[PDB]
Design a protein around this ligand. Structure first.
Ligand SMILES: CCCCCCCCCCCCCCCCCC(=O)OC[C@H](COP(=O)([O-])OCC(O)COP(=O)([O-])OC[C@@H](COC(=O)CCCCCCCCCCCCCCCCC)OC(=O)CCCCCCCCCCCCCCCCC)OC(=O)CCCCCCCCCCCCCCCCC
Ligand SMILES: CCCCCCCCCCCCCCCCCC(=O)OC[C@H](COP(=O)([O-])OCC(O)COP(=O)([O-])OC[C@@H](COC(=O)CCCCCCCCCCCCCCCCC)OC(=O)CCCCCCCCCCCCCCCCC)OC(=O)CCCCCCCCCCCCCCCCC
Ligand SMILES: CCCCCCCCCCCCCCCCCC(=O)OC[C@H](COP(=O)([O-])OCC(O)COP(=O)([O-])OC[C@@H](COC(=O)CCCCCCCCCCCCCCCCC)OC(=O)CCCCCCCCCCCCCCCCC)OC(=O)CCCCCCCCCCCCCCCCC
Ligand SMILES: CCCCCCCCCCCCCCCCCC(=O)OC[C@H](COP(=O)([O-])OCC(O)COP(=O)([O-])OC[C@@H](COC(=O)CCCCCCCCCCCCCCCCC)OC(=O)CCCCCCCCCCCCCCCCC)OC(=O)CCCCCCCCCCCCCCCCC
Ligand SMILES: CCCCCCCCCCCCCCCCC[C@@H](O)O[C@H](CO[C@H](O)CCCCCCCCCCCCCCC)COP(=O)(O)OCC[N+](C)(C)C
Ligand SMILES: CCCCCCCCCCCCCCCCC[C@@H](O)O[C@H](CO[C@H](O)CCCCCCCCCCCCCCC)COP(=O)(O)OCC[N+](C)(C)C
Ligand SMILES: CCCCCCCCCCCCCCCCC[C@@H](O)O[C@H](CO[C@H](O)CCCCCCCCCCCCCCC)COP(=O)(O)OCC[N+](C)(C)C
Ligand SMILES: CCCCCCCC/C=C\CCCCCCCC(=O)O[C@H](COC(=O)CCCCCCC/C=C/CCCCCCCC)COP(=O)(O)OCCN
Lengths: 64, 121, 329, 459, 56, 32, 102, 63, 175
């Protein structure tokens, strides 16, 4: 019971905002989101540009 | 809307004479049934508060609650219908009296109208 | 008329009857293992006939009996392909399963839940049959997941043993890593060729690009225990000896090589994927042979031998000889 | 539709005038009878809809959810029959009244041809749930959970009311048919961006989206069993249903306003799947699994392609049934163990074999095994997202692998291994629990035979 | 026993009565939307010799 | 049936507090 | 003692006082009948009759009708040499395009 | 567990067996309406556009 | 069989070789086929004849529903909701018919590919050409419309394509 309480319900009351905690939170909670956004935005921009130029060969792509 | 200053209004009349020109609500109106249901709920709550058998404590009291609620609901529905009829009548009269402010739209067909197309990709 | 279709469906159907009877009274007696063994033997001797007819004439056939569902312009139906590969691999698998079941009737006589063991073996056989005879990618995926789930259930046969559960979870992990590539290939094929059926896929893809073939190769590597994802096959020996003799030796582990064989019309058109699969086969066969040189557990040695043979047939696929790989299977 | 709404209303006087020892029997029988009546709605046509009247209409999106809602109530009664044994007659009748009111509100919500009526019932579905969570809850954290569940929902849904009345003022009607037929493009402006955010956030908070999911583990853990199943099965689908109904007027703004939510969902599916691996609680693990699946549904809806919508509907129904089954099994374990901890009771398969079979089947269905409708919806969404961008396959495959891992971890920790020695009150499983599991699982394996009934209007 | 089980089983008739009432209400509500019966540009049909309305 | 003291508490700078916690977790003071 | 409280009662086993307990109710007759009605209305009535009803639902989605219409259209267009499917959904003559003159 | 399995099987069969027998009889004796052109001057009922007799009965009775 | 029209689903004359036994060793295929016929096909044929003669004693018909043509969205007013509704339903029906046409072409392609064996790359060129043409037409018609497709959106797509092609043609002619 003590282990479960320590793992689950005792994390926030002992939490303090420190440079290490703040930096880790910002990184691990923001960096992946913007990384994936940049990757997908670049891929979709490239695909849309190829579509506008018409050099994509979208034949038989009926289902979408 | 502010129909308080509408000309020719009797200051303290619940139902003007002209309101008799409209069809009265049917006695089986769903809203009247809802007022009856509200009366029955009030009767049940009254029985519950007094610590009495809720379903079957006072049949006369529950009947009186239902009847009073139905009566007031009927008259309230008549007044509501009259007020809405007045609003529509004023709307139509004003739109007829001011043709300049409500011009007839030049009817158009979808064939000669260009709507931009945004593909989903 | 043309008993080919009738018998090729009847073998797969008769393999299912004991599963239906598993809720009957015979399941509660000691007659169940003999019942299952006799059923498998009869299925083998019945499926032996389409092999003879194919040998005599060269009969090939696809059966699309039940139309499952239509998604706009795509149709999914329960389609069975009965080409050379299927009609040749049905009797071999049934024969091996018959021998393994007869062996298990002696090896596992002291197990209280022997009937459940035979039922699990039959379920695995049915799922492998579905995988082999599948005609569209969805049915192939059904068989692909069913054999993996049966392997998970049979590796951890002894629930008390922790190593059994560890090995089962490890096998599931590696098979899901392969399923990632399998699903990639399925999605690419549907979104580009507009069909999961093998016929339309073969026709519409004269020059198959790199992505679907790399996905198929990843799935084959995952399920055939190639160098990147090899350890699950040697670790899968925590199960009973008949299971490792039937599943993780000769029938279930050749599923990836069989998948690569099935898509050989697309493999030939690409040169990079052939090189990659040849390299994968070479490295994995050398690595597992080298590991097996100094092993001391007999089952471990034979498992590494199986992995080496799997790598050898992957190499055979690499040099563009799929039929030779099927013969070696 | 009134042939469905009226009997649900009559369930209340039926319950309140029943004998003290026959409420459960009557409620279960008449709830099952109501479900049979609801089956008729499933026969949709390729044309517009079943426009019953000016107030209620049924589509092929509303039909599966309505059938599931009507089917869930008997299961909720059978689940609640256990822990309400020592409860007074009045409180048991109040509990059944709350369940019936919840079903009635959901039934009126799912058709709701007008958007303001839809919103009114969509928020009305919040009172009986809060009462159930905060009244018949065991732990002392049920109060905080109820507060979180109320406020997270209401803060998101309050701007939706303003957006709806504004739309009515400009467009002139909120009837969904008129809204669909007279739809016009939304220009790229700050005002239109904020209208989009107001109309979307109210449904994204309830789904829930990653980053706003903090209320869901609390509400699912502290609630009783019936509240847990009604939250995981039907109440989560309200957000997705509303989003698929309301995205008809947000084009073409969505084409670039979906990026933050798409990224959040496609990363939160991985985050919550990973969270499930390191969990000391069963109900929390199931709640996080529900969050992952709903994030996938969010991605599907935001992609806005026919395959996306079909997969979203299939996944909605499948996840509802699977999560309800998993919560049932966890509750049956907790009733004997009285602890609610994953590693406290182990090796239960040696003692309860049939419950081990039910655990295996539920885990396999949650694992998205073919040809179950779980994998049908999963695969449809995967193909649609692959068409959207070829790189999504990495995230989706990672999610699939982690899902398999935590599902089999849940199965192995509680079923396999050596039994715990100091527990000697593991009585044989009753017929009620076995029947509950069977009635949970059989509809899934039956719906896998006729997928077109749950594939939505874009089939 | 007649007139004894009624005092205990009279509650069972409530739900089916509600269902029948709902069906009747649905038909009555449908009776108010006949403004286009047999006037649709697609299903415009000449009436049968012994037919008064296309649908009820 | 567990008292408030048994439950986990915030990190304690003082030795007396440290001793109380070590005794709570059923381990030696210098082993904690 | 902080307050007067009943001791926490121990869980009551439904099997100890009544084998064949079905896990429904402590009154054996009501319990048995609850099991009977649950099994009859769940499995027998809904799960089977409703499944058959859904299986045999009339084709209102018009799948066979669409197949027949497509068959007739394909036959007519193949017989007369028409190019099957038409690129323009709506005929050009009906549509009016605003002139640019730019 | 065995008792539960027996009860579930008994009830499922108790309803399914009459259903299966009736389905077989209807299929073998009445089923499979054939498709014919609409006679001139005759308008069919809404339930005459379906093939299987059970589907026609359902359409006539309920919808 | 006459259940399906032969013109819509064409089939080659399927010529087959004749038995030319080189040796006197009796092949097991013929014996197995004979016994299979004897104890499988005969009982099945008798059962089917009984069922068919039972069906013939009670014969009734079902008809194919014919739909009138209604004005399209091109000749529909701006806010006339009734004409918009009729045109939208007609467009949905045409969409379903087009989908089934594409399904028919795909079925023919798959059947030809499987039938032709190892020379499928050559002997089914016509089927591939037909599928290419039909697929291009369908993609031009209905692709990229979105999940909330409607007749107005398809008409707008057609108008945009017509503007693009008219501008291209004018530029080419004026060059
Ligand atoms: C939605 C999906 C998931 C997403 C959600 C999750 C992720 C997003 C939310 C969570 C992340 C957001 C956190 C960002 C801001 C929060 C910081 C905060 O609240 O301060 C409380 C807290 C209150 O201060 P305090 O209690 O009075 O002092 C306690 C420390 O011992 C005293 O510390 P010190 O004085 O020794 O050193 C402080 C000093 C030194 O800072 C450093 O050590 C390194 C510099 C790091 C920041 C500059 C780069 O800082 C600076 O000088 C830099 C100023 C700029 O401040 C800190 O302790 C942290 C200070 C450093 C700030 C780092 C934040 C940058 C993050 C990237 C943006
Ligand atoms: C929808 C609402 C509809 C009705 C609205 C209100 C009317 C009735 C409420 C009065 C209260 C009476 C009561 O307490 O019940 C006891 C009573 C049975 O017990 P009893 O032995 O007679 O007396 C016990 C004492 O009353 C007191 O017993 P006790 O003190 O020994 O028991 C203690 C208990 C006693 O405390 C209570 O029982 C509370 C009473 C309910 C609160 C009333 C709220 C007022 C209306 C607001 C409804 C909100 C709806 C919107 C959704 C949000 C939900 C909050 O207190 C607690 O348990 C403490 C914690 C309470 C739990 C959390 C409280 C949540 C309350 C929210 C209720 C919302 C739904 C109410 C539905 C109806 C419930 C009766 O119930 C009844 O018999 C009346 C039920 C209705 C009778 C129907 C009969 C007519 C049907 C036959 C003809 C067929 C009709 C169709 C014709 C056409 C066919 C052809
Ligand atoms: C392979 C096809 C077989 C067809 C024959 C007909 C079978 C009908 C079964 C319908 C569903 C079963 C109901 C679920 C609860 C079972 C009741 C129970 O408690 O069992 C105790 C009962 C008595 O044993 P006991 O000693 O008293 O109890 C001791 C403990 O229970 C100890 O228990 P245990 O150790 O004996 O284990 C219990 C057993 C039974 O428990 C289960 O796990 C059964 C549920 C398996 C499905 C897992 C979910 C994945 C989604 C699949 C959805 C397909 C459904 C299709 C429509 C279903 C209609 C209801 O679990 C397993 O054996 C492992 C199952 C994993 C199989 C993975 C392969 C799945 C895909 C295979 C292809 C399916 C589509 C084919 C398409 C192409 C071919 C045409 O044992 C049985 O009744 C066993 C039944 C046979 C197992 C069936 C497994 C595969 C069949 C799935 C549906 C058939 C597809 C149609 C194809 C027809 C050709
Ligand atoms: C846990 C489980 C939970 C279950 C919950 C409830 C289940 C829900 C499902 C309900 C759905 C019911 C439904 O829709 O029925 C479907 C469907 C109904 O068909 P339909 O659409 O109404 O009829 C279409 C035609 O227009 C009409 O065709 P027709 O009129 O030409 O056919 C003639 C007729 C009659 O045909 C015949 O009798 C003769 C045919 C063979 C004759 C062969 C010769 C025999 C005699 C010759 C020898 C004697 C004479 C010579 C003696 C001398 C000997 C030398 O055939 C039938 O009557 C079909 C029987 C349908 C029974 C379906 C059972 C559903 C029961 C629902 C509840 C389930 C409870 C479980 C227990 C059920 C009971 C076990 O029935 C079936 O599909 C039966 C299965 C057929 C499959 C054949 C096997 C092929 C396997 C391929 C896969 C292999 C790879 C692995
Ligand atoms: C061999 C046969 C195999 C197939 C068997 C299939 C049996 C299906 C039975 C299940 C039916 C599901 C319920 C369907 C309800 C939806 C339809 C319902 O709302 O219709 C109502 C009618 O419902 C029926 O009158 C009552 C059916 C209720 C009972 C169904 C049978 C099973 C009931 C079992 C109850 C418990 C049995 C006893 C247990 C002890 C109102 O119709 P209405 O809107 O006016 O129709 C207008 C069109 N008209 C004019 C052409 C008619
Ligand atoms: C935390 C858990 C999840 C909660 C919900 C998260 C989702 C909310 C995020 C909001 C989505 C996007 C908001 C705005 C999108 C418009 C695009 C804009 O941001 O990009 C540039 C806009 O430039 C700048 O971004 C201006 C806005 C800067 C101020 C906004 C605050 C940014 C950081 C605040 C984050 C706080 C979010 C959570 C609040 C509680 C483009 O410049 P420009 O092309 O010229 O203008 C485009 C718009 N036009 C065409 C109509 C004119
Ligand atoms: C215990 C050991 C095993 C014993 C059992 C042995 C027997 C084996 C049988 C088990 C599975 C074998 C597969 C056999 C399948 C044959 C039946 C199948 O073909 O019928 C399906 C039909 O089944 C139904 O469609 C599926 C059931 C409907 C689902 C509703 C669930 C029931 C309601 C409960 C509440 C639902 C909650 C969730 C709401 C969404 C498919 O229909 P379809 O091929 O097209 O054509 C039907 C006939 N037509 C041509 C006239 C139209
Ligand atoms: C779980 C917690 C979630 C909290 C959600 C809260 C954020 C919801 C999004 C914003 C809500 C307010 C939007 C307003 C409602 C829409 C009404 C509308 O669209 O009308 C606009 C009006 O637009 C506005 O007034 C918007 C003002 C916003 C003020 C309140 C700010 C609230 C916080 C803003 C940032 C939040 C955005 C991200 C929230 C993420 C979740 C935390 C048009 O203006 P007109 O008068 O017609 O001009 C036409 C002539 N040119």
């Amino acid at each position: 019971i003590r282990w479960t309480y320590a793992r689950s319900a005792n994390i926030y009351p002992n939490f303090r905002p420190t440079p290490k905690t703040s930096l880790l939170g910002a990184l691990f909670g923001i960096g992946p989101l913007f990384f994936w956004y940049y990757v997908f935005k670049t891929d979709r921009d490239k695909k849309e540009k190829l579509i506008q130029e018409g050099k994509l060969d979208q034949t038989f792509n009926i289902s979408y | 809307t502010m129909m308080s200053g509408r000309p020719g209004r009797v200051p303290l009349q619940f139902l003007p004479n002209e309101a008799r020109s409209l069809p009265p609500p049917k006695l089986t109106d769903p809203r009247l049934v809802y007022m009856g249901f509200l009366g029955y709920c009030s009767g049940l709550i009254d029985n519950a508060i007094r610590r009495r058998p809720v379903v079957s404590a006072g049949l006369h009291r529950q009947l009186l609650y239902v009847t009073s609620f139905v009566f007031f609901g009927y008259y309230l529905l008549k007044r509501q219908d009259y007020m809405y009829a007045l609003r529509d009548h004023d709307m139509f009269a004003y739109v007829k009296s001011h043709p300049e402010d409500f011009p007839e739209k030049d009817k158009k067909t979808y064939g000669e109208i260009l709507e931009e197309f945004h593909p989903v990709r | 008329m043309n008993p080919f279709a009738s018998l090729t469906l009847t073998t797969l159907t008769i393999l299912t009857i004991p599963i239906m009877m598993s809720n009957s009274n015979i399941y509660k007696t000691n007659l169940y293992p003999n019942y299952v063994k006799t059923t498998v033997s009869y299925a083998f001797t019945l499926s032996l006939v389409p092999l003879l007819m194919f040998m005599h004439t060269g009969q090939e056939m696809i059966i699309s009996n039940w139309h499952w569902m239509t998604l706009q312009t795509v149709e999914l139906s329960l389609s069975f392909k009965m080409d050379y590969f299927s009609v040749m691999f049905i009797p071999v698998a049934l024969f091996v399963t018959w021998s393994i079941m007869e062996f298990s009737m002696w090896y596992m006589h002291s197990d209280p839940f022997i009937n459940r063991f035979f039922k699990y073996l039959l379920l695995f056989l049915i799922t492998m049959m579905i995988l082999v005879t599948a005609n569209n990618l969805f049915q192939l995926f059904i068989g692909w997941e069913g054999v993996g789930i049966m392997s998970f259930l049979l590796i951890g046969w002894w629930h008390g043993r922790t190593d059994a559960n560890t090995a089962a979870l490890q096998a599931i992990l590696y098979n899901r890593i392969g399923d990632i590539g399998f699903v990639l290939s399925m999605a690419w094929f549907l979104t580009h060729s507009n069909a999961w059926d093998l016929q339309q896929i073969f026709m519409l893809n004269n020059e198959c690009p790199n992505m679907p073939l790399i996905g198929l190769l990843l799935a084959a590597a995952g399920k055939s225990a190639q160098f990147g994802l090899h350890p699950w096959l040697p670790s899968a020996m925590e199960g009973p000896t008949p299971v490792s003799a039937l599943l993780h030796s000769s029938t279930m582990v050749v599923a990836g090589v069989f998948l690569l064989i099935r898509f050989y019309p697309l493999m030939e058109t690409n040169k990079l994927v052939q090189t990659m699969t040849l390299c994968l086969g070479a490295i994995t066969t050398l690595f597992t042979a080298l590991c097996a040189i100094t092993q001391n557990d007999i089952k471990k040695i034979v498992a590494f031998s199986t992995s080496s043979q799997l790598g050898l047939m992957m190499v055979t696929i690499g040099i563009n000889q799929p039929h030779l790989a099927f013969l070696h299977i | 539709m009134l042939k469905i709404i009226i009997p649900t209303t009559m369930l209340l006087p039926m319950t309140w005038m029943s004998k003290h020892n026959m409420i459960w029997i009557n409620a279960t029988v008449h709830s099952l009878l109501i479900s049979l009546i609801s089956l008729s709605l499933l026969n949709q046509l390729g044309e517009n809809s079943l426009n019953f009247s000016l107030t209620f209409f049924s589509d092929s999106l509303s039909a599966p959810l309505l059938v599931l809602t009507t089917w869930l109530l008997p299961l909720m009664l059978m689940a609640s029959q256990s822990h309400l044994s020592k409860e007074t007659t009045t409180r048991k009748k109040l509990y059944i009244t709350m369940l019936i009111l919840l079903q009635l509100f959901l039934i009126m919500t799912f058709t709701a041809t007008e958007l303001i009526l839809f919103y009114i019932l969509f928020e009305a579905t919040l009172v009986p749930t809060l009462i159930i969570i905060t009244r018949w809850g065991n732990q002392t954290e049920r109060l905080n959970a109820g507060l979180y569940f109320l406020f997270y929902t209401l803060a998101g849904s309050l701007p939706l009311l303003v957006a709806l009345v504004y739309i009515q003022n400009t467009t002139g009607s909120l009837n969904f048919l008129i809204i669909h037929y007279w739809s016009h493009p939304l220009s790229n402006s700050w005002s239109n961006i904020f209208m989009w955010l107001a109309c979307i956030m109210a449904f994204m908070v309830k789904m829930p989206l990653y980053g706003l999911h903090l209320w869901l583990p609390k509400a699912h853990v502290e609630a009783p069993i019936a509240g847990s199943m009604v939250l995981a099965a039907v109440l989560l689908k309200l957000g997705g249903y509303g989003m698929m109904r309301i995205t008809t007027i947000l084009n073409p703004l969505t084409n670039y306003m979906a990026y933050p939510f798409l990224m959040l969902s496609m990363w939160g599916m991985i985050m919550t799947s990973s969270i499930c691996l390191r969990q000391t609680d069963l109900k929390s693990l199931i709640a996080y699994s529900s969050v992952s699946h709903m994030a996938l549904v969010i991605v599907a809806i935001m992609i806005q392609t026919p395959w996306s919508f079909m997969g979203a509907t299939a996944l909605m129904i499948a996840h509802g049934l699977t999560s309800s089954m998993l919560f049932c099994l966890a509750n049956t374990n907790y009733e004997r163990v009285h602890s609610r901890t994953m590693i406290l009771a182990r090796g239960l398969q040696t003692l309860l074999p049939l419950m081990a079979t039910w655990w295996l089947v539920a885990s396999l269905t949650n694992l998205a095994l073919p040809p179950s409708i779980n994998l049908i919806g999963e695969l449809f969404i995967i193909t649609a997202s692959f068409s959207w961008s070829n790189i999504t396959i990495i995230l989706m495959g990672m999610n699939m692998m982690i899902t398999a891992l935590y599902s089999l971890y849940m199965l192995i920790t509680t079923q396999r291994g050596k039994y715990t020695h100091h527990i000697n009150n593991i009585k044989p499983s009753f017929t009620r629990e076995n029947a509950l599991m069977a009635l949970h699982i059989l509809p899934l394996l039956l719906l896998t035979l006729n997928p077109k009934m749950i594939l939505g209007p874009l089939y | 026993n007649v007139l004894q089980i009624v005092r205990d089983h009279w509650v069972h008739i409530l739900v089916p009565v509600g269902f029948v009432f709902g069906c009747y209400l649905d038909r009555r509500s449908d009776e108010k939307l006949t403004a286009f019966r047999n006037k649709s540009l697609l299903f415009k049909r000449e009436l049968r010799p012994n037919e008064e309305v296309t649908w009820k | 049936h567990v008292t408030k003291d048994m439950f986990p508490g915030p990190y304690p700078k003082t030795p007396e507090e440290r001793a109380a916690a070590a005794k709570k977790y059923n381990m030696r003071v210098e082993d904690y | 003692i902080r307050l007067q409280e009943d001791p926490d009662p121990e869980d009551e086993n439904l099997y100890e006082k009544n084998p064949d307990s079905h896990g429904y109710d402590k009154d054996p007759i009501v319990d048995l009948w609850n099991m009977r009605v649950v099994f009859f209305f769940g499995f027998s009535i809904v799960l089977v009759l409703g499944s058959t009803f859904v299986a045999y639902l009339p084709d209102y989605r018009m799948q066979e009708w669409a197949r027949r219409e497509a068959e007739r259209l394909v036959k007519y267009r193949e017989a007369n040499g028409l190019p099957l499917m038409e690129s323009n959904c709506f005929d050009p003559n009906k549509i009016q395009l605003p002139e640019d003159e730019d | 567990d065995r008792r539960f399995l027996k009860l579930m099987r008994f009830y499922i069969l108790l309803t399914g067996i009459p259903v299966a027998i009736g389905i077989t009889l209807v299929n073998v004796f009445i089923g499979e309406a054939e498709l014919a052109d609409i006679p001139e001057g005759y308008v069919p009922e809404h339930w005459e556009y379906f093939k299987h007799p059970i589907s026609r009965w359902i359409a006539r009775t309920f919808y | 069989p006459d259940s399906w029209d032969k013109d819509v689903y064409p089939e080659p004359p399927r010529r087959t070789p004749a038995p030319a036994p080189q040796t006197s060793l009796p092949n097991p295929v013929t014996y197995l086929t004979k016994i299979f016929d004897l104890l499988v096909d005969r009982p099945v044929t008798l059962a089917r004849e009984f069922i068919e003669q039972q069906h013939a004693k009670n014969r009734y018909y079902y008809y194919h529903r014919e739909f009138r043509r209604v004005p399209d969205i091109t000749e529909c007013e701006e806010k006339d909701i009734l004409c918009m509704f009729e045109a939208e339903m007609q467009w949905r029906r045409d969409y379903k018919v087009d989908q089934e046409i594409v399904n028919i072409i795909q079925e023919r392609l798959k059947a030809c590919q499987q039938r032709e064996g190892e020379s499928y790359r050559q002997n089914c060129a016509k089927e591939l050409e037909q599928f290419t043409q039909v697929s291009k037409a369908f993609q031009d018609r209905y692709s990229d419309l979105g999940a909330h497709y409607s007749a107005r959106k398809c008409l707008a797509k057609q108008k945009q394509r017509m503007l693009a092609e008219r501008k291209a043609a004018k530029e080419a002619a004026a060059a």
